[PDB]
Amino acid sequence: DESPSFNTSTSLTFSYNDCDAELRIWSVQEDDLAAGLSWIPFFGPGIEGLYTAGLIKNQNNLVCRLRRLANQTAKSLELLLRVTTEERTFSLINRIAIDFLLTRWGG
Amino acid sequence: DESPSFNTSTSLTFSYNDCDAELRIWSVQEDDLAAGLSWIPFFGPGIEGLYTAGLIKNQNNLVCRLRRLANQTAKSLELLLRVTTEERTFSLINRIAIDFLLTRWGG
Amino acid sequence: SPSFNTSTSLTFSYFNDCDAELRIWSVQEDDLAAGLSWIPFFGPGIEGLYTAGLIKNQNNLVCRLRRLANQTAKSLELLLRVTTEERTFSLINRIAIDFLLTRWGG
Amino acid sequence: DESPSFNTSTSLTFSYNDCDAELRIWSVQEDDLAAGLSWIPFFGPGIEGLYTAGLIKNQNNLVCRLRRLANQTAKSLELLLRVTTEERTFSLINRIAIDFLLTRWGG
Amino acid sequence: DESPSFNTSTSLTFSYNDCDAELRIWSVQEDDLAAGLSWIPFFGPGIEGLYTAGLIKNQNNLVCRLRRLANQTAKSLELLLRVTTEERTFSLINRIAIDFLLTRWGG
Amino acid sequence: DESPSFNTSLTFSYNDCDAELRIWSVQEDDLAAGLSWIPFFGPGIEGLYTAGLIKNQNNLVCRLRRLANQTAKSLELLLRVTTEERTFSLINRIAIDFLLTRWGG
Amino acid sequence: GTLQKTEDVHLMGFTLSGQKVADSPLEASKRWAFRTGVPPKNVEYTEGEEAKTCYNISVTDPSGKSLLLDPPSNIRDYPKCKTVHHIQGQNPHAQGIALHLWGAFFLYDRVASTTMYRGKVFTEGNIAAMIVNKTVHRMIFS
Amino acid sequence: GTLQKTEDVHLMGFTLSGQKVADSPLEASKRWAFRTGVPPKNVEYTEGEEAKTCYNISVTDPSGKSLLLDPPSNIRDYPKCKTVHHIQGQNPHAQGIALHLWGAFFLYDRVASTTMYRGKVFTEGNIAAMIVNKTVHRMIFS
Amino acid sequence: SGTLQKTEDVHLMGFTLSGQKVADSPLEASKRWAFRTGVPPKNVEYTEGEEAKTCYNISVTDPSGKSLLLDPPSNIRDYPKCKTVHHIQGQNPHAQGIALHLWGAFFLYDRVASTTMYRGKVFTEGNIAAMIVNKTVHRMIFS
Amino acid sequence: GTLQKTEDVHLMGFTLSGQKVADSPLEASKRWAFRTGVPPKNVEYTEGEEAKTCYNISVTDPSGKSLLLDPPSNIRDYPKCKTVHHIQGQNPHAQGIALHLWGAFFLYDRVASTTMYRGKVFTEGNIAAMIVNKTVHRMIFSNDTGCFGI
Amino acid sequence: CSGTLQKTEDVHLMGFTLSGQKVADSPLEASKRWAFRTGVPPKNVEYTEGEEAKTCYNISVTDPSGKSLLLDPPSNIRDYPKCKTVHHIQGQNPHAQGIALHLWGAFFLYDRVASTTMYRGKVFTEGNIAAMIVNKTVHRMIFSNDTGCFGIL
Amino acid sequence: GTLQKTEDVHLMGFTLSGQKVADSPLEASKRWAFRTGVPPKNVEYTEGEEAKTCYNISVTDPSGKSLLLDPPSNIRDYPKCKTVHHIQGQNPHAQGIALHLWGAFFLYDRVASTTMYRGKVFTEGNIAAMIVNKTVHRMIFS
Numbered sequence A, B, D, E: 001d002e003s004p005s006f007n008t009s010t011s012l013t014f015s016y017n018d019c020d021a022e023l024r025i026w027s028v029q030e031d032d033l034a035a036g037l038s039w040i041p042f043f044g045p046g047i048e049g050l051y052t053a054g055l056i057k058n059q060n061n062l063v064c065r066l067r068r069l070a071n072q073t074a075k076s077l078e079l080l081l082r083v084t085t086e087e088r089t090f091s092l093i094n095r096i097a098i099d100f101l102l103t104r105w106g107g
Numbered sequence C: 001s002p003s004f005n006t007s008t009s010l011t012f013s014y015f016n017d018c019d020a021e022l023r024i025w026s027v028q029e030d031d032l033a034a035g036l037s038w039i040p041f042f043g044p045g046i047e048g049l050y051t052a053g054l055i056k057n058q059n060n061l062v063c064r065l066r067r068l069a070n071q072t073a074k075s076l077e078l079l080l081r082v083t084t085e086e087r088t089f090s091l092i093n094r095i096a097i098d099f100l101l102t103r104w105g106g
Numbered sequence F: 001d002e003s004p005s006f007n008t009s010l011t012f013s014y015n016d017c018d019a020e021l022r023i024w025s026v027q028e029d030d031l032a033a034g035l036s037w038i039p040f041f042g043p044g045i046e047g048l049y050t051a052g053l054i055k056n057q058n059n060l061v062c063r064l065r066r067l068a069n070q071t072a073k074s075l076e077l078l079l080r081v082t083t084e085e086r087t088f089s090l091i092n093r094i095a096i097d098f099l100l101t102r103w104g105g
Numbered sequence G, H, L: 001g002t003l004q005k006t007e008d009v010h011l012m013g014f015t016l017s018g019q020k021v022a023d024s025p026l027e028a029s030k031r032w033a034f035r036t037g038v039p040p041k042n043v044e045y046t047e048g049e050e051a052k053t054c055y056n057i058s059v060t061d062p063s064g065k066s067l068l069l070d071p072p073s074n075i076r077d078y079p080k081c082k083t084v085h086h087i088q089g090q091n092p093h094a095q096g097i098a099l100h101l102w103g104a105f106f107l108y109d110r111v112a113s114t115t116m117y118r119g120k121v122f123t124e125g126n127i128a129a130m131i132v133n134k135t136v137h138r139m140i141f142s
Numbered sequence I: 001s002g003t004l005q006k007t008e009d010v011h012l013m014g015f016t017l018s019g020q021k022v023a024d025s026p027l028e029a030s031k032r033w034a035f036r037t038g039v040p041p042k043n044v045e046y047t048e049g050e051e052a053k054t055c056y057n058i059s060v061t062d063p064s065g066k067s068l069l070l071d072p073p074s075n076i077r078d079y080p081k082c083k084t085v086h087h088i089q090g091q092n093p094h095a096q097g098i099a100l101h102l103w104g105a106f107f108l109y110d111r112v113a114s115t116t117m118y119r120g121k122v123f124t125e126g127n128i129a130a131m132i133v134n135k136t137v138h139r140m141i142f143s
Numbered sequence J: 001g002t003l004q005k006t007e008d009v010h011l012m013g014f015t016l017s018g019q020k021v022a023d024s025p026l027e028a029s030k031r032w033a034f035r036t037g038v039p040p041k042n043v044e045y046t047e048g049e050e051a052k053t054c055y056n057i058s059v060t061d062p063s064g065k066s067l068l069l070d071p072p073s074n075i076r077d078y079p080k081c082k083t084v085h086h087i088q089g090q091n092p093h094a095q096g097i098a099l100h101l102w103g104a105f106f107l108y109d110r111v112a113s114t115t116m117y118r119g120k121v122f123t124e125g126n127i128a129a130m131i132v133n134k135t136v137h138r139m140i141f142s143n144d145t146g147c148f149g150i
Numbered sequence K: 001c002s003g004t005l006q007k008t009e010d011v012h013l014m015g016f017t018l019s020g021q022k023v024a025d026s027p028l029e030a031s032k033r034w035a036f037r038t039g040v041p042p043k044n045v046e047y048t049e050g051e052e053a054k055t056c057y058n059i060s061v062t063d064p065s066g067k068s069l070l071l072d073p074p075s076n077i078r079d080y081p082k083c084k085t086v087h088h089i090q091g092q093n094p095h096a097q098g099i100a101l102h103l104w105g106a107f108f109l110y111d112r113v114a115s116t117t118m119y120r121g122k123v124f125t126e127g128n129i130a131a132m133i134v135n136k137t138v139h140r141m142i143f144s145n146d147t148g149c150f151g152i153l
C-alpha cells in the first residue's frame, strides 16, 4: 500500500500509452456548508444529491501514474484482507496514517 | 472537533447565563484492581453496578467552557459521521490520537 | 497491554509451570505470494491456509512468553470491559499508537 | 502325510465291505464365489448358512480309495501332531505345498 | 490376492484424480545394526520409539496405483479371511511366497 | 539366519567350546511299535525323549556352538518385528528361503 | 499538550437539560421529525451526565406496527435518569426515520445516535472531547 | 510530502474500462468464477471513478433460488453509470460464491468487495491509496 | 508330475467312520473312548467334510458335580450336518485326565479335528485326507 | 525499541495445556460457570499454538434447548488439535452465559472469546502481544453428567 | 520373467488409509459406515507398515444397563501409531446386538493389525492393506451420553 | 547340499554352560535385568543339549506379588538337568519384565523365550538352524 504525494512548485513532484486522457470524477462534498444549516441530517442532501462531479486534468501525466497504481495496490491488499477474519467493512486510513509515522521516525 | 488539554496548577490551565454550575457525572471506575478478582467477568459488577457517580467542581470556569465545547463539537462530528457509510460502531479515540500526533509533530 | 520486544533473540526489553517445546501455526506471507497465487480463486481455503513451525528456547524465551500470557490478561479484560461492541475488536493499531505515544511526547 | 493328485487325462490318471458308494458332503460355495455385496461380512451368509451340499459320484472307484486313504493318513498325522507343543488350531496346507515344491525339485 | 513387482532399471517397469500425491508412512527400521547393541531387547527402543518416518515420492505415479490396488485386493482378502476359523492374527507372507513359487514355471 | 547342510569328508556349506555334546531327541523307533502311535497308547510327556551323543570327528560341535552364538543375533531381530506373543515357528521360513535362493543358483 | 497514553482521551455527554432548554414533553416534540433516505449513524463515548428528563416513546401506524427502527444488541437504556416520561402516540401522515432538528444526539448507554429506537430510554444531548491524565482526574473528580 | 490531518488520505478507485479492457458481457464471464471455501471481504473507499458500463446480474438454478450472497445493509447500488445491462442468467453446474479471476474488485457505492451480491449494480476495478491536502486538491477540480 | 498351481487347491476332507460300515450305536460306540492323564490335546484345521449319519452330545460328571471334559475354546463349534443327534448323560467316579480315542480316529467338529472330547459340543468320529484338485475338475466331479 | 511497520506486531495465543495445567475433561470442567448480566466480548489475534486437548461441548436444558449462545459468522473451529473431546450434558437450574473462572480465554480460529459458543471446537488459553523484526522472525522460526452446576 | 523375490524378508505391505482416498473422515459422517450384526466371528490379519493417518477415533458404545457392546481387545491389539487428531466419542445404542462391522469392506487398522471389528478403548483408523514386493536397493533408494450411535439399517 | 522334506531341518538349543561360562547362581544373576516397554516373545525349537545347571527362581515384591509373568499352557519345565537351583529373593525397585543382558534365550521344553516365567525350570542358551537328512543322521547320532 504505497502512496504518492502533492509536492508542487519547488508542476507536481510525486514521491512514492495505455491510459485514458479524460477523467471526470464524483466526490464527497467539500463546501456543502454555505448557509450554516445544511449540516443537519434532516436538512442534509440525502443520498441522491450527495455527490459532486468534477474533472481532473492531466498536467504532468498524473492520470497514467494513478491508473498504473492499480496493480501494485491490489497485489498487496488481497493479502492484507486474507489475514483479517471479518466480512464487514474495513477502513485503511488509520493504517496508512500510522504507517507513515512509523516510516518517518525510523531513525 | 476540538480537544482541550488540562494541566494542574497554572486551578487548571485550559491551554487548547445558560450554563449550570452543577455538573455531576457517572464514569467507569479504575480502582477495581485492589479487589484482586474483580477483573474476572464472573466476579465483576455487571451492567447496573458498573458505574460510579461523582461531582466535577467549577474551579476556573471550566463547566461552561465544556458546555460550549459540546455545542459546536457536533457541528464537525455530524459531518464526520456523514462521510462514512457503516451503520454502527465508530470509536473516534484513535482518530483523535492520530490527529494529535500529526499536529504537534509535523516538522 | 504489556508489550514485549524481541530485539538483538538477545534483547528482551519490555514496555516449573513451563514447557520448552513451542510449536506454532501462522500465515507466512513470504511464500504465499508465489506468482499468481494471491488470487482468491487461485488460493487456499480455510483448511490449508496455515503453516507449521517450532520456536527454539534460546534465552528462555517460551518460559517468559507464558509469563507474558499471565501478565497481559488482566489489562486485556479491563480493556474489554470498557468497550461496548460485541464483535471482534482490532487491537494492533492501539499498540502501534501507544508505542509512538510513549516514545516521544510530553 | 501323503496326497494324491486327482487330475484329468487331457480310464483316468491318478497319482501318489468297508466302503459306502454314496458320498454327500458339505462345502464352501461350490461356484459363484463373487457377487455384488456378498464378500462383505455384514451382508454375508452367516455362521449357520455358508455351507452348500454336494454329491460326489463314485465313477472310477473313487470314494472307496479315498476312505482307505483317510483311514491310513492318521498314522502320519498323529505322529506329526505329537511333536508340536501348540494346542491351538494347526494349519497344514502350507506344509503340503512346501513338500510338493521340495519333492518335485529332485535335481 | 494381487502382488506387484517394482524393479529399477535392468526404468521403473511394473509387474502383476481421486488420490493424494504425498505418501508419508511409518516403517519399522531400515538398519538398526549400526548401533551395535540395539538388537538386545533390554537395550532396544521399546514400543514408542520403534518406528521411523519416511516419504514415498509420486514421481512415477506409484502412490495412486497403490491406493487403487489396496481397494481392489480388499475383496479377495475378505474372501480369504472368511474361510479360516482362527481369530488370532494370520500371516500372509508365506502364502504369497508359496503362491509366487507355484504361479510361474515357464521361463 | 544361517543354516548349514551336512554331506554324506563331510563338506559344510552355509577356550569357549566343549568337545562332549550329548542331546535329547524325539523318538524314532516308537513309530515301528505298531500301536504306540495312538495318543492313548503313547509314552507321555516324560517318556518322550531319548538321550544320544554327537561325536566330534570334524570339529562340528565347536562350529555348531558358534553357529548358535551368531544365530541368536539374527533371530532376535526377527522376533522383534512380529506382533504375536505365543509360540512362533521358523521351519517354513527356512524351507521357503531355501527354495527361493535355490532358483537363483 | 501532553498525552502519555491512549486512555487519556475522554468523550463526555452533556444534555440540554443542563443548558436551560425547555424539556417538558409538550414542547420537546417539535425538535423531532421524520425523513426518508437518511441512514442512521451512531458513535460511542465514555462518560456521561445524569439527566433531569428522559423519554420512553413508541409510535405506531394505523396498521399497528411501530415506525421506529429495531435497536441493535449494543443499544441499552440510559444509565441514570431522575424522571422518565412514557408517551404512546400515533402519526398516520409520516413515514421514515426519526431525526433531530437541532442536530443534537439521542443518548443511550455510551452510544450517541442520530435516530430514535423503540423500547429504549434515551435523552437529548451532545458529546465533547478532552485530554486529561490521572493526576488531574483524581483532583477534579470527587 | 507531509499530511497534517487524517482526512487527507484519499482512496480513489479506477475501473478497468480506462485501460481499453473489453467490456462486452458475452466475453466478460470468463473473468468470473465460482468457488467454495473463500470468505468475502469488503474495503471502504472514499471516492471512485465511474464506469462506462455496469452490470446487474443474477444467477439462478433449476431449484429456483439465487446462488449469490445477499447484500448487507451497507451495500448500495453504484452511483454513476452510463449504460447498465440488466442480465438474467441460469447456471446449473456451479457451487460456492463468485470470485474475480484477475484479482480486481467489484466496486459498489464506496464499498469494494471481492464477491457478487444479489440485485446490486457494480463495476470492475481496483483502488489506489494517496495523499493530497486541501490546496493541491483546490488547484485541481475547482 | 503334478498339477498344483495355487495354494488353496489343497483340500482336507474328513470322512466319518459310519461310512466305513463301522457300528455307531451308542451302546457299542462308547468302547472306543477312554481317559488318560499326561497327554496334551491337539487340534488340526480342515476344510470340508462328509454329511454325518449319527452324531453325539455327551456330558460326563464326577459325583462331586464337576465335568471331566475340557472347556471348549472359541474355535470349537458344533458339527454342521447331523441326521441323528444322540444325547447321553453319564457319571464316572474313578476316571481322571482327558478323553481319548482308542482307534486313533479324530473327533470331528466344524472344520477342526481334535484328539479329545469337549463339553457341550456335538462331534462325530472320523479321519481326514489331503488331496489336490483344481477348479475345473472339482466343478466336473462335485455336482 | 524498533518498530518500522504495523503487521510485525504479533498477537499469539498460548494454551493452558503447555503450562502444566491438567486438562482432562472430568476435572477441567470446574473452571467454567454460568452467569446472567455480562455481555460477551471478542478479540482478534494472529498466530497460535498447537493444542494438546480441544473440546466440543453441548449443554442442554430439560426442555431440549441449548444454553450456549449462537455463534457469529466470524467464529470458526480451532485449527490444530491433537485430541478432540465430545461432551454432552444437561443442567436444569443454571441460566445465563458461560464464563471462565480463571479469567482466561476460549480460543477459536484467530478469535479469543469470554464465552462459549454452540457447536464450535475451542481450547483454553491466553493471548500475548509482542513486536518482532522481519529478519529476527526469519532467524528464530523453523447426557455424560451434570457438568458446571457451580 | 520378473523373478525379483530372492528372500522372504522383503516384506513391504503398506496399509493405506481412506483419508487419502478423498473419503469424508468427519466423525459425524464416518458413523454411517458402521453397524452391529450378530452371527459373524471377528477376524484379524497382520500388516507390518502403513500410512500416517489424519483422523483417528476413540469410541465407546454402551447399553442402558451399562455394559460395553464392543469386544475386549486381545494382548496384541495396541493403539494406532500416527494420528494427527484423535476423536473421543462416548455414546450408547439401546436396540443393537452383535459386534461392530464396516459396511464397505475397509479394515479397522491398529498397531500392525487390521481387524473387521472394533475393540474396547483402542484407537483405530480405516484403511485397506496392499501386498507388494520390493527389494532392499529400491526401498533404500526411495524411502525418504450421545445416544443413537451407529443408528440402524 | 540338498533338502528333501520339510521335517529334515532341526533347531538345536546349545546352553551357555558348554561355552566355559561360569554358572553359579550368584554369578549368573547379573545377566538378568528388569525393563518395561517390551513385549515377551517365544520361539519353537525341536531339540537341544541338557544343561549342567538349571534355575527355579521366584522374585516377589515386599507386598507379596511376584514380578515374573504367569506361564502359558505351552510352557513346561526343562527336560534334563544335572543340578537345579532354588533361589528366591526380593527387589523393591524392580518393575517390568525380566530380560537377558547378553541377548541369550531362556530355554524351556521346546520353547525358547526372551523372558523369565514363574515357577518353571529354565536354562540359558541359544538355538541354531541346521539341515541333516535321515540318511546320515544315525552316522552322527549315538
Ligand SMILES: *[C@@H]1O[C@H](CO)[C@@H](O[C@@H]2O[C@H](CO)[C@@H](O[C@@H]3O[C@H](CO[C@H]4O[C@H](CO)[C@@H](O)[C@H](O)[C@@H]4O)[C@@H](O)[C@H](O[C@H]4O[C@H](CO)[C@@H](O)[C@H](O)[C@@H]4O)[C@@H]3O)[C@H](O)[C@H]2NC(C)=O)[C@H](O)[C@H]1NC(C)=O
Residues within 6 Å of the ligand: A070, A071, H019, H102, H104, H126
Ligand atoms: C497490470 O498491468 C498490466 C500490464 O500488462 C495490464 O495489462 C494486462 O495484464 C493482464 C495480466 O497479466 C493480461 O491478462 C493476461 O494476458 C495474456 C493474454 O495473452 C493472450 O491473448 C492475446 C490476445 O488475446 C494473444 O497474444 C494470445 O492469445 C495470448 O495467449 C494471458 O497471459 C492471459 O490470458 C490467459 O490466461 C490464462 C493462461 O493461459 C488462461 O487461463 C486464460 O484462459 C487466458 O488464456 C491474461 O488475459 C492482459 O492481457 C493485459 N492487458 C493488455 C492490454 O496488455 C493490466 O491491466 C494491469 N492490471 C491488472 C492485472 O489488474
Ligand SMILES: *[C@@H]1O[C@H](CO)[C@@H](O[C@@H]2O[C@H](CO)[C@@H](O[C@@H]3O[C@H](CO[C@H]4O[C@H](CO)[C@@H](O)[C@H](O)[C@@H]4O)[C@@H](O)[C@H](O[C@H]4O[C@H](CO)[C@@H](O)[C@H](O)[C@@H]4O)[C@@H]3O)[C@H](O)[C@H]2NC(C)=O)[C@H](O)[C@H]1NC(C)=O
Residues within 6 Å of the ligand: F016, F069, F070, F072, F073, L101, L102, L103, L104, L126
Ligand atoms: C557369544 O560368546 C561370547 C564369548 O565367547 C559372548 O561375548 C561376551 O559378551 C558380553 C557382552 O556383554 C561381554 O561382557 C562385557 O564384558 C566387559 C566386562 O569387563 C570385564 O572383562 C574384561 C574381559 O573379561 C576385562 O576388561 C575385565 O576383566 C573386566 O572386568 C564389559 O565390556 C561389559 O560390561 C558392560 O556391562 C556391565 C553390566 O551392565 C556394565 O558395566 C556396562 O553396561 C558395560 O558396558 C560386558 O559385561 C563378555 O565379556 C563377552 N565374553 C568374552 C569372553 O569376551 C557373547 O555374548 C555370546 N553371544 C551370545 C548371543 O550369547
Ligand SMILES: *[C@@H]1O[C@H](CO)[C@@H](O[C@@H]2O[C@H](CO)[C@@H](O[C@@H]3O[C@H](CO[C@H]4O[C@H](CO)[C@@H](O)[C@H](O)[C@@H]4O)[C@@H](O)[C@H](O[C@H]4O[C@H](CO)[C@@H](O)[C@H](O)[C@@H]4O)[C@@H]3O)[C@H](O)[C@H]2NC(C)=O)[C@H](O)[C@H]1NC(C)=O
Residues within 6 Å of the ligand: B018, B071, G101, G102, G103, G104
Ligand atoms: C447550542 O446549540 C443549539 C443547537 O444545537 C442552539 O439552539 C438553537 O437556538 C436557536 C435560537 O433559539 C434556534 O433558532 C430558532 O429558534 C426559535 C425557537 O423558539 C421557539 O420557542 C419560542 C418560545 O420562546 C417561540 O419563538 C416559538 O415557539 C419557537 O418555536 C425559532 O425562532 C426558530 O424555529 C422555527 O420557527 C418558526 C416555526 O416556529 C419557523 O418560521 C422557523 O423557520 C424555524 O424553523 C429557530 O429554530 C435553533 O433552532 C437552535 N438550533 C440550531 C441548530 O441552531 C443553541 O442556541 C446553542 N447555544 C449556545 C449557547 O450557543
Ligand SMILES: *[C@@H]1O[C@H](CO)[C@@H](O[C@@H]2O[C@H](CO)[C@@H](O[C@@H]3O[C@H](CO[C@H]4O[C@H](CO)[C@@H](O)[C@H](O)[C@@H]4O)[C@@H](O)[C@H](O[C@H]4O[C@H](CO)[C@@H](O)[C@H](O)[C@@H]4O)[C@@H]3O)[C@H](O)[C@H]2NC(C)=O)[C@H](O)[C@H]1NC(C)=O
Residues within 6 Å of the ligand: E018, E071, E074, K018, K032, K103, K104, K105, K106, K128
Ligand atoms: C473403493 O473406492 C470406491 C470409491 O472410489 C468406494 O465406492 C463407494 O462405495 C460405497 C458403498 O457403500 C458407495 O456408497 C453407496 O452409494 C449409493 C448412494 O450414495 C450416494 O449416491 C449418489 C452420489 O451422487 C447420490 O444420490 C447421493 O449422494 C447418495 O448418498 C447407494 O448405492 C448406497 O446406499 C446404500 O446404503 C444406504 C445406507 O445409508 C441405504 O440407502 C442402502 O443400503 C443403500 O444400498 C451407498 O451409500 C459409494 O457411492 C462409492 N463411491 C463411489 C465414488 O463410487 C468403495 O467403498 C471403496 N472400497 C473400500 C473402501 O473397500
Ligand SMILES: *[C@@H]1O[C@H](CO)[C@@H](O[C@@H]2O[C@H](CO)[C@@H](O[C@@H]3O[C@H](CO)[C@@H](O)[C@H](O)[C@@H]3O)[C@H](O)[C@H]2NC(C)=O)[C@H](O)[C@H]1NC(C)=O
Residues within 6 Å of the ligand: G056, G057, G058, G077, G118, G119, G120, G121
Ligand atoms: C419503553 O417503551 C416501550 C414501549 O413499547 C416498552 O417496551 C415494552 O415493554 C414491556 C415490558 O417489558 C413489554 O411487555 C412484555 O413483552 C413480552 C411479550 O408479551 C413478555 O416478555 C412480557 O409478557 C411482557 O408483556 C412490551 O412488549 C414492550 N413493548 C414492545 C413494543 O416491545 C419499554 O419497556 C419501555 N422501557 C422502560 C424502561 O419502561
Ligand SMILES: *[C@@H]1O[C@H](CO)[C@@H](O[C@@H]2O[C@H](CO)[C@@H](O[C@@H]3O[C@H](CO)[C@@H](O)[C@H](O)[C@@H]3O)[C@H](O)[C@H]2NC(C)=O)[C@H](O)[C@H]1NC(C)=O
Residues within 6 Å of the ligand: H056, H057, H058, H077, H086, H118, H119, H120, H121
Ligand atoms: C437490479 O436487478 C434487481 C433484480 O435482480 C432489481 O431488484 C428488483 O427491484 C424491483 C423494483 O424495486 C423490486 O420490486 C419491488 O420489490 C418489493 C417486494 O417486497 C416491493 O417494494 C415492491 O412491491 C416491488 O415488487 C424487486 O423485488 C427487486 N428484485 C429482487 C430480486 O430483489 C433492481 O431494481 C435492479 N436495479 C436496477 C438499478 O435496475
Ligand SMILES: *[C@@H]1O[C@H](CO)[C@@H](O[C@@H]2O[C@H](CO)[C@@H](O[C@@H]3O[C@H](CO)[C@@H](O)[C@H](O)[C@@H]3O)[C@H](O)[C@H]2NC(C)=O)[C@H](O)[C@H]1NC(C)=O
Residues within 6 Å of the ligand: I057, I058, I059, I085, I120, I121, I122
Ligand atoms: C448338547 O448338550 C449341551 C449340554 O446340555 C447343551 O448345552 C446347553 O444348551 C442350552 C440351550 O442353549 C443352554 O441353556 C441356556 O443357558 C443360559 C442360562 O440359562 C441361557 O443362555 C439360556 O436361557 C438357556 O437356558 C445350556 O446352558 C447349555 N448347557 C451347557 C452345560 O453349556 C447343548 O445345547 C446340546 N447341543 C445340542 C442340543 O445341539
Ligand SMILES: *[C@@H]1O[C@H](CO)[C@@H](O[C@@H]2O[C@H](CO)[C@@H](O[C@@H]3O[C@H](CO)[C@@H](O)[C@H](O)[C@@H]3O)[C@H](O)[C@H]2NC(C)=O)[C@H](O)[C@H]1NC(C)=O
Residues within 6 Å of the ligand: J056, J057, J058, J077, J118, J119, J120, J121, K027, K028
Ligand atoms: C461439535 O458437535 C456439534 C453437535 O454437538 C456438531 O454440530 C453439528 O454439525 C452438523 C454438521 O454441520 C450439523 O448438521 C447439519 O445441520 C443442518 C440441519 O438443518 C443442515 O445444515 C445440514 O443438513 C446438516 O445436517 C448439526 O446440526 C450440528 N449440530 C448442532 C447441535 O449444532 C459439530 O459439527 C461438532 N464439531 C466437530 C468438529 O465435529
Ligand SMILES: *[C@@H]1O[C@H](CO)[C@@H](O[C@@H]2O[C@H](CO)[C@@H](O[C@@H]3O[C@H](CO)[C@@H](O)[C@H](O)[C@@H]3O)[C@H](O)[C@H]2NC(C)=O)[C@H](O)[C@H]1NC(C)=O
Residues within 6 Å of the ligand: K058, K079, K121, K122, K123
Ligand atoms: C481412549 O479412551 C479410553 C477411554 O477409556 C482411554 O483409556 C483410559 O485411559 C486413562 C488414562 O490413562 C485411564 O485412567 C487411568 O486408569 C488407571 C485406573 O484408574 C490409573 O492408572 C490412573 O489413575 C488413571 O485413572 C483409564 O482407566 C482408561 N480407561 C479404561 C477403560 O481403561 C484411552 O487412553 C484413550 N486412548 C488414548 C490414546 O488416549
Ligand SMILES: *[C@@H]1O[C@H](CO)[C@@H](O[C@@H]2O[C@H](CO)[C@@H](O[C@@H]3O[C@H](CO)[C@@H](O)[C@H](O)[C@@H]3O)[C@H](O)[C@H]2NC(C)=O)[C@H](O)[C@H]1NC(C)=O
Residues within 6 Å of the ligand: L056, L057, L058, L077, L118, L119, L120, L121
Ligand atoms: C519350582 O518352584 C515352584 C515355586 O516357586 C514350585 O511350584 C510349587 O509346586 C508345588 C508342588 O506342585 C505346589 O504345591 C501344590 O499347589 C497346589 C495348591 O497351590 C496343590 O496342587 C497342592 O496342594 C500343593 O500345595 C506349589 O503351589 C507351587 N508353587 C507355586 C508358587 O506355584 C515348583 O514345583 C518348582 N519346580 C521344580 C521342578 O522343583
